[PDB]
Design an enzyme around this catalytic site. Structure first.
Site, mmCIF file in Angstrom:
data_model
loop_
_atom_site.group_PDB
_atom_site.id
_atom_site.type_symbol
_atom_site.label_atom_id
_atom_site.label_comp_id
_atom_site.label_asym_id
_atom_site.label_seq_id
_atom_site.Cartn_x
_atom_site.Cartn_y
_atom_site.Cartn_z
ATOM 1 N N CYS B 106 76.939 22.975 63.555
ATOM 2 C CA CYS B 106 76.917 23.514 62.192
ATOM 3 C C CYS B 106 78.278 23.324 61.538
ATOM 4 C CB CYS B 106 76.539 25.007 62.176
ATOM 5 S SG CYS B 106 76.490 25.674 60.466
ATOM 6 N N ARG B 109 79.958 26.771 59.270
ATOM 7 C CA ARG B 109 80.352 28.008 59.944
ATOM 8 C C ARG B 109 81.535 28.730 59.299
ATOM 9 N NH1 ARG B 109 80.983 26.215 65.990
ATOM 10 N NH2 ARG B 109 81.228 24.150 64.970
ATOM 11 N N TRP B 278 72.401 27.151 52.899
ATOM 12 C CA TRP B 278 72.188 26.273 51.766
ATOM 13 C C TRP B 278 72.530 24.866 52.235
ATOM 14 C CZ3 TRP B 278 75.815 30.332 51.179
ATOM 15 C CH2 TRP B 278 77.152 29.960 51.365
ATOM 16 N N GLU B 283 72.602 15.973 53.675
ATOM 17 C CA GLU B 283 71.370 16.172 54.427
ATOM 18 C C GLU B 283 70.177 15.693 53.619
ATOM 19 O OE1 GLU B 283 71.154 20.098 56.584
ATOM 20 O OE2 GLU B 283 72.699 20.535 55.070
HETATM 21 C C1 HEM Z 1 75.624 28.709 54.622
HETATM 22 C C2 HEM Z 1 75.679 27.371 54.471
HETATM 23 C C3 HEM Z 1 75.403 26.391 55.636
HETATM 24 C C4 HEM Z 1 75.665 25.068 55.633
HETATM 25 C C5 HEM Z 1 76.325 24.246 54.506
HETATM 26 C C6 HEM Z 1 75.246 24.520 56.905
HETATM 27 C C7 HEM Z 1 75.365 23.217 57.305
HETATM 28 C C8 HEM Z 1 74.807 22.631 58.410
HETATM 29 C C9 HEM Z 1 74.589 21.210 58.599
HETATM 30 C C10 HEM Z 1 74.980 20.110 57.555
HETATM 31 C C11 HEM Z 1 74.038 21.065 59.826
HETATM 32 C C12 HEM Z 1 73.574 19.792 60.541
HETATM 33 C C13 HEM Z 1 72.095 19.749 60.193
HETATM 34 C C14 HEM Z 1 71.392 18.424 60.366
HETATM 35 O O1 HEM Z 1 72.078 17.387 60.504
HETATM 36 O O2 HEM Z 1 70.129 18.420 60.368
HETATM 37 C C15 HEM Z 1 73.872 22.380 60.419
HETATM 38 C C16 HEM Z 1 73.354 22.671 61.667
HETATM 39 C C17 HEM Z 1 73.198 23.955 62.145
HETATM 40 N N1 HEM Z 1 73.415 25.124 61.446
HETATM 41 FE FE1 HEM Z 1 74.368 25.304 59.713
HETATM 42 N N2 HEM Z 1 74.740 25.545 57.663
HETATM 43 C C18 HEM Z 1 74.795 26.700 56.913
HETATM 44 C C19 HEM Z 1 74.334 27.918 57.355
HETATM 45 C C20 HEM Z 1 73.883 28.219 58.612
HETATM 46 C C21 HEM Z 1 73.359 29.494 59.029
HETATM 47 C C22 HEM Z 1 73.247 30.679 58.042
HETATM 48 C C23 HEM Z 1 73.027 29.386 60.331
HETATM 49 C C24 HEM Z 1 72.455 30.408 61.342
HETATM 50 C C25 HEM Z 1 72.434 31.713 61.071
HETATM 51 C C26 HEM Z 1 73.346 28.043 60.750
HETATM 52 C C27 HEM Z 1 73.168 27.519 62.006
HETATM 53 C C28 HEM Z 1 73.103 26.175 62.301
HETATM 54 C C29 HEM Z 1 72.697 25.633 63.573
HETATM 55 C C30 HEM Z 1 72.274 26.487 64.811
HETATM 56 C C31 HEM Z 1 72.758 24.303 63.469
HETATM 57 C C32 HEM Z 1 72.462 23.257 64.559
HETATM 58 C C33 HEM Z 1 71.012 23.285 65.013
HETATM 59 C C34 HEM Z 1 70.928 22.176 66.035
HETATM 60 O O3 HEM Z 1 71.453 22.388 67.166
HETATM 61 O O4 HEM Z 1 70.361 21.102 65.697
HETATM 62 N N3 HEM Z 1 73.851 27.361 59.687
HETATM 63 N N4 HEM Z 1 74.357 23.308 59.528
HETATM 64 C C1 LIG Z 2 71.032 26.751 58.480
HETATM 65 C C2 LIG Z 2 71.072 25.285 58.074
HETATM 66 C C3 LIG Z 2 71.639 24.945 56.865
HETATM 67 C C4 LIG Z 2 71.683 23.605 56.493
HETATM 68 N N1 LIG Z 2 72.214 23.243 55.325
HETATM 69 N N2 LIG Z 2 71.151 22.660 57.257
HETATM 70 C C5 LIG Z 2 70.611 22.962 58.440
HETATM 71 C C6 LIG Z 2 70.068 21.941 59.206
HETATM 72 C C7 LIG Z 2 69.539 22.252 60.445
HETATM 73 C C8 LIG Z 2 68.888 21.253 61.284
HETATM 74 C C9 LIG Z 2 67.630 20.882 60.801
HETATM 75 C C10 LIG Z 2 66.857 19.951 61.490
HETATM 76 C C11 LIG Z 2 67.354 19.405 62.666
HETATM 77 C C12 LIG Z 2 66.552 18.402 63.474
HETATM 78 C C13 LIG Z 2 65.973 17.308 62.598
HETATM 79 N N3 LIG Z 2 67.032 16.305 62.362
HETATM 80 C C14 LIG Z 2 68.596 19.811 63.141
HETATM 81 C C15 LIG Z 2 69.366 20.736 62.454
HETATM 82 O O1 LIG Z 2 70.585 21.109 62.911
HETATM 83 C C16 LIG Z 2 69.479 23.548 60.886
HETATM 84 F F1 LIG Z 2 68.905 23.778 62.091
HETATM 85 C C17 LIG Z 2 69.987 24.579 60.106
HETATM 86 C C18 LIG Z 2 70.547 24.282 58.873
HETATM 87 CL CL LIG Z 3 66.552 19.272 56.150
#
Ligand code: HEM
Ligand SMILES: Cc1cc(N)nc2cc(-c3ccc(CCN)cc3O)c(F)cc12
Ligand SMILES: [Cl-]
Ligand code: HEM
Ligand SMILES: Cc1cc(N)nc2cc(-c3ccc(CCN)cc3O)c(F)cc12
Ligand SMILES: C[C@H](O)[C@H](O)[C@H]1CNc2nc(N)[nH]c(=O)c2N1
Ligand SMILES: C[C@H](O)[C@H](O)[C@H]1CNc2nc(N)[nH]c(=O)c2N1
Ligand SMILES: [Ca+2]
Ligand SMILES: [Ca+2]
Ligand SMILES: [Cl-]
Ligand SMILES: [Gd]
Ligand SMILES: [Gd]
Ligand SMILES: [Zn+2]
EC number: 1.14.13.39
Lengths: 401, 402
Positions: B106, B109, B278, B283
């Site tokens: 993420c 964070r 958000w 993405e």
């Molecule tokens: C608030 C604005 C946030 C932004 C801009 C953001 C951004 C991102 C992005 C760009 C990714 C990679 C996603 C992908 O490539 O599909 C990601 C992954 C992730 N985000 Fe965030 N996020 C946000 C909030 C959160 C929140 C609120 C949570 C949990 C409470 C969270 C937990 C995670 C987790 C667990 C992943 C990785 C999931 C995995 O292992 O594939 N995020 N986030």
């Molecule tokens: C909280 C949150 C915010 C964001 N802005 N984006 C997020 C993207 C992913 C996420 C979505 C799909 C996949 C697998 C498909 N590629 C991995 C991810 O980490 C996620 F879990 C959480 C996200």
């Molecule tokens: Cl998405």
């Protein structure tokens, strides 16, 4: 035990059986991954024997007659000398394999085509300079670049080593000031003080080609100027931004890395410069746009009348793309070999598939294979990769000083 | 401890936090698998619970206090009597925030301390689940001023099935498998779309059809719930200067709300705990619209832009991708829906790393996922070495429940 490797664009699956053969230990453990880090007696005989076995299996004549004769040769050599001598065909195979094994090299589809220049009979910095200038001339080839390596004498006990103090054969100077900034290439700041310290009278431009500080065993390093007509440079212009030429940007044709160590069957060549041709993102994105390199991105963005006040206009991205366009156009216009990141990564995908059949896998460093712009627009982004260390290998090594 | 270098500035830190890494990753000194997408009972539960409690009491600066000791004994007794335990409300809030803080992939964070935690642990039916999810969506969407939220449904427990949300996100576009082998709508959602139809949903045929939710209550087949259209905030995509762009009829939804991950806190497991923030614009602009295996619009945009798509060295792909990302950011800003571009998101993540170095001596970060899919080295995280490792509490992948 054989890692499953998936391509998420196509869904195809392979298994890296080559990883089992990993010679040496990488930085990672089950507790933590350090894949993103840039710098992560009878020993000689086990590695030497390993390599010979490799070699003869690769020409299909292992187990058979010349195989054992070679092994007992190296055995007796090391007993006699403490080291041993590679046959010229072993050096060639060893240089190619070391390139083929380089996890961070996206250009490895070319690995079979490498010109190996045997300089193991070199003595003095003056002869090194001649070998190096011959290399540069051969590899440049008037702009139709040809991959080449020149192998200087291996490290041996009791004797010092041949070192090229420069990280590359072509390096632009980096000068500091009492305003703190650097004029020229901040990367080369250090080798530039060293060249000045050792007698080089400095230029004061942004693209002053450095001298070569070549070092013969035990000898101090000697300064050598490169003949201007030897160092092919490409002035950078843009196909449609006619003010881009006036920025005065240039880069050189020949990517020729001269500070890595070549290891073949336990032998170590601390001087073995190799060269290929450039991928355009190396110049246009990393060398010219890195904040700690020429850092020209905002300059270009200002010239494109972009809105640099907000990140969300993506002025950085638009400026970067046009700098890469300028590089591609400028090299092509000068008929200097260059490959764009889409072509190179598409070829690396072919390389992966060829290597899967050839030997069950391919060590690849995802963070370095994926280009520094448009990552996910290229097919390597969607390709899972396994990184491991095979030998023969190119290795980083401490600086000579 | 691993030394970690920023190559833009030269700074060096040591990640001492990695030394506390719980679970094992996929790497060995033999070979690095950091690029792999999916790399993967009384007394081990107790070490997990006590460690979590210790984290809770450190977070409020009352470590070793009598309240700390008493809570540990309280957890100990409940595990000994019941084989499991219940989080206090404040521990659940803290644990959901920690799982976000620990998510190595993420980049968002910096926000981890601002998380609305909805406690749905007394949920008892798929219908109540749906009501909780609608509340979540309403709260988080906030008519485009997005707010990070997580709703935590009841934990896993012996002798009762899990709550599960079958959908991978709360808002997904249907992906209709054409018989050609091609897909209309989003190819990423072909499987869940087919499960929706097979469970009684009457499909559409557009490219941006919001999927219904398949909600699974314990020991119960999934139940279908249609989202109220006024709950699903969407953004029509237009470009600030390419007026034909609007004619592509592109849209994306406001709220990224992932519903298929398992939340693990102190050894307890919450198989349904959808969370949302958000979007980062890449993405949508780069992956969702330009992945060849997603909407795959890159060539069409480049053709419309009049670029020379016959040679790669014109960089038509990079030019078309950049304008698509511009359109996404312009369109969300126009619609007044929160969105962050990859430059702001990565700069803020660099601040996060600095905060976390001081706060905990490190930060688990998956370089391949933190660097954006376009313009990677133009962002500062490209030049930041990172250490990837698994801490708990954690969000984890889990098997699809079918
Ligand atoms: C608030 C604005 C946030 C932004 C801009 C953001 C951004 C991102 C992005 C760009 C990714 C990679 C996603 C992908 O490539 O599909 C990601 C992954 C992730 N985000 Fe965030 N996020 C946000 C909030 C959160 C929140 C609120 C949570 C949990 C409470 C969270 C937990 C995670 C987790 C667990 C992943 C990785 C999931 C995995 O292992 O594939 N995020 N986030
Ligand atoms: C909280 C949150 C915010 C964001 N802005 N984006 C997020 C993207 C992913 C996420 C979505 C799909 C996949 C697998 C498909 N590629 C991995 C991810 O980490 C996620 F879990 C959480 C996200
Ligand atoms: Cl998405
Ligand atoms: C033929 C055209 C070639 C192309 C297009 C190419 C491309 C590249 C690129 C883009 C990198 C990443 C470098 C960086 O980001 O700074 C790289 C690294 C590397 N290349 Fe190639 N290269 C070529 C030829 C060669 C040759 C001829 C050799 C050796 C004989 C070689 C060995 C290596 C090694 C060892 C590395 C990694 C060094 C390190 O670990 O830092 N390459 N190459
Ligand atoms: C043969 C070759 C071709 C090419 N087109 N490019 C190359 C780039 C590097 C390279 C240069 C510097 C550094 C460290 C400073 N970043 C690492 C490298 O891999 C290299 F060795 C060899 C290259
Ligand atoms: C920290 C990170 O490892 C560093 O910035 C890497 C990332 N990937 C790279 N990839 C290539 N091709 N060349 C590089 O120098 C780097 N640098
Ligand atoms: C093979 C590779 O790991 C895979 O494509 C990853 C790379 N990095 C990523 N990074 C992010 N943020 N999101 C992703 O989906 C991916 N995909
Ligand atoms: Ca001064
Ligand atoms: Ca109780
Ligand atoms: Cl370079
Ligand atoms: Gd002007
Ligand atoms: Gd227009
Ligand atoms: Zn690793």
């Amino acid at each position: 035990k054989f890692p499953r490797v998936k391509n998420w664009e196509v869904g195809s699956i392979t298994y890296d059986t080559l990883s089992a053969q990993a010679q040496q230990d990488g930085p990672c453990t089950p507790r933590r991954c350090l894949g993103s880090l840039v710098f992560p007696p009878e020993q000689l005989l086990s590695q030497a024997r390993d390599f010979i076995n490799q070699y003869y299996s690769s020409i299909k004549r292992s187990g058979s007659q010349a195989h054992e004769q070679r092994l007992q040769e190296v055995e007796a050599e090391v007993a006699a000398t403490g080291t041993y001598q590679l046959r010229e065909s072993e050096l060639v195979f060893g240089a190619k394999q070391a390139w083929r094994n380089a996890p961070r090299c996206v250009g490895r589809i070319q690995w079979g085509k490498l010109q190996v220049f045997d300089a193991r009979d070199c003595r003095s910095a003056q002869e090194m300079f001649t070998y190096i200038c011959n290399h540069i001339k051969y590899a440049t080839n008037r702009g139709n670049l040809r991959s080449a390596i020149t192998v200087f004498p291996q490290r041996c006990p009791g004797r010092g080593d041949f070192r090229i103090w420069n990280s590359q054969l072509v390096r632009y100077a980096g000068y500091r000031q009492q305003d703190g900034s650097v004029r020229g290439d901040p990367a080369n700041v250090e080798i530039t003080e060293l060249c000045i310290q050792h007698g080089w009278t400095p230029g004061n431009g942004r693209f002053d080609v450095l001298p070569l500080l070549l070092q013969a065993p035990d000898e101090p390093p000697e300064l050598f100027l490169l003949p201007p007509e030897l160092v092919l440079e490409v002035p950078l212009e843009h196909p449609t931004l006619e003010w881009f030429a006036a920025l005065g940007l240039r880069w050189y044709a020949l990517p020729a890395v001269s500070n890595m160590l070549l290891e073949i069957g336990g032998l170590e060549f601390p001087a073995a410069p190799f060269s290929g041709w450039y991928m355009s993102t190396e110049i246009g994105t990393r060398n010219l746009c890195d904040p700690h390199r020429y850092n020209i991105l905002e300059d270009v963005a200002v010239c494109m009348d972009l809105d640099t006040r907000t990140t969300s206009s993506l002025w950085k991205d638009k400026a970067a793309v046009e700098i890469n366009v300028a590089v591609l156009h400028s090299y092509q216009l000068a008929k200097v070999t260059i490959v764009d990141h889409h072509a190179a990564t598409a070829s690396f995908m072919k390389h992966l598939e060829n290597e899967q059949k050839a030997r069950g896998g391919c060590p690849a460093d995802w963070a370095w294979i994926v280009p520094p712009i448009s990552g996910s627009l290229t097919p390597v982004f969607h390709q899972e990769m396994v990184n491991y260390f095979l030998s023969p290998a190119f290795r980083y090594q401490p600086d000579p000083w």
